[PDB]
Amino acid sequence: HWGYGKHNGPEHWHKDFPIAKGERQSPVDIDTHTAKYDPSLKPLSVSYDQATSLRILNNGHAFNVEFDDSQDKAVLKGGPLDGTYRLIQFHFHWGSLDGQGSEHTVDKKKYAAELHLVHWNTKYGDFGKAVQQPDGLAVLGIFLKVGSAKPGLQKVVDVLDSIKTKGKSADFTNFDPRGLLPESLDYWTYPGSLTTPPLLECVTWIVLKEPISVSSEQVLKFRKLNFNGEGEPEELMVDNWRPAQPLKNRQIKASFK
Ligand SMILES: Cc1ncc(-c2ccc(S(N)(=O)=O)cc2)o1
Ligand SMILES: Cc1ncc(-c2ccc(S(N)(=O)=O)cc2)o1
Ligand SMILES: [Zn+2]
Give the burial class of 95: count Cβ atoms within 10 A of its Cβ; 0-12 exposed, 13-18 middle, 19 or more buried. Answer: buried
Q: How far is the CA of 241 from the centre of ligand 2 (A)?
A: 12
Q: How many CA atoms lie within 13 A of 215 on its CB side?
A: 11
Residue 205 makes CB contacts below 8 A (sequence gap 6+) with 26, 27, 104, 139, 141, 188, 189, 190, 191, 192
Q: How far is the CA of 1 from the centre of ligand 1 (A)?
A: 5
Letter for the amino acid at 6?
Answer: K
Does 196 count as an annotated binding residue? yes
Nearest to 65 by CA among 186, 164, 159, 185: 159
Q: How far is the CA of 208 from the centre of ligand 1 (A)?
A: 33
d(CA 55, CA 12): 31
Residue 72 makes CB contacts below 8 A (sequence gap 6+) with 84, 86, 122
Residue whose CA is at the smallest distance from ligand 2 atom 14? 194
Answer yes or no: are the C-beta atoms of 19 and 2 closer than 8 Å: no
Element of type H or E holding 140? strand 137-146
Per DSSP, helices labelled H in 70-140 are: 127-130
Query: By what method was this entry solved?
Result: X-ray
d(CA 210, CA 200): 27
Q: Which atom of ligand 2 is nearest to the CA of 198?
A: 1
CA 222 from centre of chain: 15
Answer yes or no: are the C-beta atoms of 250 and 24 closer than 8 Å: yes
Most distant CA pair in the chain, distance = 54
d(CA 36, CA 224): 40
Does the C-beta of 232 come closer than 6 Å to ligand 1?
no
d(CA 253, CA 37): 6
Residue whose CA is at the smallest distance from ligand 1 atom 15? 8
- Provide the residue count of the chain: 257
Nearest to 57 by CA among 160, 176, 200: 160
Residue positions annotated with a catalytic role = 61
CATH of 1-257, one of 3.40.30.10, 3.20.20.10, 3.40.50.720, 3.10.200.10: 3.10.200.10
Does the C-beta of 11 come closer than 6 Å to ligand 1?
no
Q: How many CA atoms lie within 13 A of 59 on its CB side?
A: 18
Neighbours of 71 (CB within 10 A): 11
Element of type H or E holding 149? none
